[PDB]
Amino acid sequence: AKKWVTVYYGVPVWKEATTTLFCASDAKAYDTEVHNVWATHACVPTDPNPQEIVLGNVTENFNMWKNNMVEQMHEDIISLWDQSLKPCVKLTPLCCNTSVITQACPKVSFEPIPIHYCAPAGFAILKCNSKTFNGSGPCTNVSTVQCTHGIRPVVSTQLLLNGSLAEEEIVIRSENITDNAKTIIVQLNEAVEINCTRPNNNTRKSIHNIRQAHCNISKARWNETLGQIVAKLEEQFPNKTIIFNHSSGGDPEIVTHSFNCGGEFFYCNTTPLFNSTWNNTRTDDYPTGGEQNITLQCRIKQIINMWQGVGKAMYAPPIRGQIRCSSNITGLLLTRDGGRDQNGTETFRPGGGNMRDNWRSELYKYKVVKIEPLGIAPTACKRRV
Amino acid sequence: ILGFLGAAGSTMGAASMALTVQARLLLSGIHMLQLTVWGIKQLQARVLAVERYLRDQQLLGIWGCSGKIICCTNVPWNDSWSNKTINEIWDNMTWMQWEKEIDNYTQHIYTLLEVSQIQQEKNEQELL
Amino acid sequence: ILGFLGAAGSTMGAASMALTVQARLLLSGIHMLQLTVWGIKQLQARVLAVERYLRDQQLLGIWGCSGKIICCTNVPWNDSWSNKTINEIWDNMTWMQWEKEIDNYTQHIYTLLEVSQIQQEKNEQELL
Amino acid sequence: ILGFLGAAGSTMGAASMALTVQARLLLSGIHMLQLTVWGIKQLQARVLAVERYLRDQQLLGIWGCSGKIICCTNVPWNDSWSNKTINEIWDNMTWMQWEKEIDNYTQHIYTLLEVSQIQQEKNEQELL
Amino acid sequence: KKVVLGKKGDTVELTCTASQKKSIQFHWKNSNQIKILGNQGSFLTKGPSKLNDRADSRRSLWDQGNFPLIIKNLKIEDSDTYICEVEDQKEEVQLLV
Ligand SMILES: *[C@@H]1O[C@H](CO)[C@@H](O[C@@H]2O[C@H](CO)[C@@H](O[C@@H]3O[C@H](CO)[C@@H](O)[C@H](O[C@H]4O[C@H](CO)[C@@H](O)[C@H](O)[C@@H]4O[C@H]4O[C@H](CO)[C@@H](O)[C@H](O)[C@@H]4O)[C@@H]3O)[C@H](O)[C@H]2NC(C)=O)[C@H](O)[C@H]1NC(C)=O
Ligand SMILES: *[C@@H]1O[C@H](CO)[C@@H](O[C@@H]2O[C@H](CO)[C@@H](O)[C@H](O)[C@H]2NC(C)=O)[C@H](O)[C@H]1NC(C)=O
Ligand SMILES: *[C@@H]1O[C@H](CO)[C@@H](O[C@@H]2O[C@H](CO)[C@@H](O)[C@H](O)[C@H]2NC(C)=O)[C@H](O)[C@H]1NC(C)=O
Ligand SMILES: *[C@@H]1O[C@H](CO)[C@@H](O[C@@H]2O[C@H](CO)[C@@H](O)[C@H](O)[C@H]2NC(C)=O)[C@H](O)[C@H]1NC(C)=O
Ligand SMILES: *[C@@H]1O[C@H](CO)[C@@H](O[C@@H]2O[C@H](CO)[C@@H](O)[C@H](O)[C@H]2NC(C)=O)[C@H](O)[C@H]1NC(C)=O
Ligand SMILES: *[C@@H]1O[C@H](CO)[C@@H](O[C@@H]2O[C@H](CO)[C@@H](O)[C@H](O)[C@H]2NC(C)=O)[C@H](O)[C@H]1NC(C)=O
Ligand SMILES: *[C@@H]1O[C@H](CO)[C@@H](O[C@@H]2O[C@H](CO)[C@@H](O)[C@H](O)[C@H]2NC(C)=O)[C@H](O)[C@H]1NC(C)=O
Ligand SMILES: *[C@@H]1O[C@H](CO)[C@@H](O[C@@H]2O[C@H](CO)[C@@H](O)[C@H](O)[C@H]2NC(C)=O)[C@H](O)[C@H]1NC(C)=O
Ligand SMILES: *[C@@H]1O[C@H](CO)[C@@H](O[C@@H]2O[C@H](CO)[C@@H](O)[C@H](O)[C@H]2NC(C)=O)[C@H](O)[C@H]1NC(C)=O
Ligand SMILES: *[C@@H]1O[C@H](CO)[C@@H](O)[C@H](O)[C@H]1NC(C)=O
Ligand SMILES: *[C@@H]1O[C@H](CO)[C@@H](O)[C@H](O)[C@H]1NC(C)=O
Ligand SMILES: *[C@@H]1O[C@H](CO)[C@@H](O)[C@H](O)[C@H]1NC(C)=O
Question: List the disulfide bonds (chain A) (predicted).
Answer without folding.
Answer: 23-43, 88-105, 95-96, 118-147, 128-139, 196-215, 261-325, 268-298
